[PDB]
């Protein structure tokens, strides 16, 4: 109802869309000058810019959070109601764009960090038939009380992760990524470690979401 974002907008008239959330900290522009690279004319990348929130993580200063963050370890405390909160948040743009002509099985759900953990939370509860999740370096919110969901999950999930990530434990993704193929089919998710790499992204990586997007949205 009332998005601000840096989008990037396709060459072609639009026909697949994108929603990409970026990193706890910064803003979409990060985001969408790096998607602006790997860009399929049909497709558009939404970059949202998440408020600006305490974090219970930081002294409850305020810094851009999509929701309130209390830890990075799988017995943390998360914030069950800002989490839903953002997911219904996510879910309305979703349904937005289905209502002005882009169907939900055209729509993919990517982000980073706790972007990529409210990305992957929204496309696991979205009851839309959603394309795919391109989650990077993240982890899966409320993943113990998860029934190993949502409705339609014949969702495509391409995790990638930092083998030497010193933010979000490579082993929080390596269990959020054994508890995605419980969901949905096996064979529909990819889990990439990439080897030297840390709490970042690399061309490689770059490389594996261009070729899931290319493969996932095809130009039709």
């Not at 764009?97 to 990305?119: C, D, T």
């Not at 990077?136 to 969901?149: E, I, K």
């Amino acid at each position: 109802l009332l998005t601000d974002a840096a989008t990037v907008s396709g060459a072609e008239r639009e026909t697949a869309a994108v929603i990409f959330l970026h990193g706890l900290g910064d803003t979409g522009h990060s985001w969408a000058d790096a998607l602006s690279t790997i860009r399929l004319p049909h497709v558009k990348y939404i970059c949202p810019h998440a408020p600006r929130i305490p974090v219970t993580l930081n002294m409850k200063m305020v810094m851009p959070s999509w929701f309130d963050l209390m830890g990075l370890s799988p017995d943390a405390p998360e914030d069950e109601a800002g989490i839903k909160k953002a997911a219904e948040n996510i879910k309305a743009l979703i349904e937005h764009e289905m209502k002005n002509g882009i169907p939900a099985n055209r729509i993919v759900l990517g982000g980073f960090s706790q972007g990529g953990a409210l990305s992957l939370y929204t496309a696991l509860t979205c009851p839309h038939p959603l394309a795919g999740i391109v989650a990077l370096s993240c982890w899966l919110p409320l993943h113990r009380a998860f029934p190993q969901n949502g409705s339609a999950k014949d969702l495509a999930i391409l995790q990638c992760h930092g083998e030497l990530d010193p933010m979000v434990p490579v082993r929080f993704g390596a269990l959020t990524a054994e508890k995605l193929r419980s969901v949905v089919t096996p064979a529909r998710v990819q889990f990439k470690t990439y080897p030297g790499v840390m709490h970042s992204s690399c061309p490689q990586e770059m490389a594996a979401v261009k070729e899931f997007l290319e493969k996932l949205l095809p130009p039709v």
